[PDB]
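User: Predict Type IV pilus biogenesis protein PilB's structure from this.
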Amino acid sequence: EREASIQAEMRTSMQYVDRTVGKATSIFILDDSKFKGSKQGLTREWSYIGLSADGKKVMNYVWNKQKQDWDVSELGTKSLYNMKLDLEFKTEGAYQDNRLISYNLTGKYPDTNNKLGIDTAISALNTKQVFSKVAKGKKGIAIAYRTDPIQGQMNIAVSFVFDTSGSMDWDLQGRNVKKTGNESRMDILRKKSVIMIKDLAEIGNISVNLVGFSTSAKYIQQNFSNLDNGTNTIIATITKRENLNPDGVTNPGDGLRYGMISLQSQPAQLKYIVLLTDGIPNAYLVDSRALYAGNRVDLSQGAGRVTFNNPIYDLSPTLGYEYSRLGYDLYSRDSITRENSIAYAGEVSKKFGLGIKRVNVIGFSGVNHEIAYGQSLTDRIGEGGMETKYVSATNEEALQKTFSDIKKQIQQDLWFVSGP
Ligand SMILES: [Cl-]
Ligand SMILES: [Mg+2]
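Assistant:
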């Protein structure tokens, strides 16, 4: 009967873990790629709990800061008879507003096959910033944590790229705001992106600029405002009504070009495009090289479109517009022009998207067919190799939810990259 106090020792060890875990303000569950025992591999300023190399002790590497090292201490009180241990952590949903965690701490007795310990014990955490870095179907055998915030996070740049075509004067259902009573799409976009800015502000260390696009793109605010120095200057731009004035067609490639090149010139380590469009892509710019012979066919007066038989997209870092370089279809019905408009955005993404963490695309229309190429546009932008995500917002509160979700997801990239 050496069992009785081995089981008591494992339980007290687990209470030790739960005690120190209960004081953490951020938690990462780790698999054996970022913890092997040791201190070889430990990311600085993160404290850790996990099993020894020999697998026989539960230990706690605490961050020193003043000695800038780890204070290797065993969590527990006594030997365990050179027994080898199995330690596993797991998130397990929530109880009210608390996130749950499960602990496993077992091991078979010397040279018996009697399992000892706790197969699973549920506890609750005091932080909502609990993250998993367990790839694969790996087990997850260790934890990294902090008890005080991470001081000095990364910088984040967000380029907003907003459709300003003429359709943005109608209401979400595509009816005239004078005959219905509703706000215009642009009215709703102004309000809901002001909200999104104040929400982004809370993350801290986060700058934004504003690109408009319709027939072609324009910087509404070209340089990046840090919100920690004031929400004020950009909210003035978004709500000033000589700005974002609806007019033109839909040239998302050019908008994306302005967005991505301005992001390339920002130092931030997390970079984002938030692209909002309310219509079928129906415009693109060509390089001057494409102005030859019978390449440009001008059906503009009797069909409402100008197309290029062989488009060479305007991929220049020199940002310019000329009517002679414009492919477009005012009726958004010609399959070729639509294809060329979507492909332009993909070519722009491949050239200009190298540093970019994610492109979010928002289809913002209550009219089904106007956003029927939102996913298609996003997928083409995805050829540039970054993460992409398409969302449709068909009413005023879908948009505010999509904005909030995008904030929540940037906050989580930030947490995840500051992590161990
Ligand atoms: Cl998607
Ligand atoms: Mg439109």
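The longest strand covers residues 86-95.
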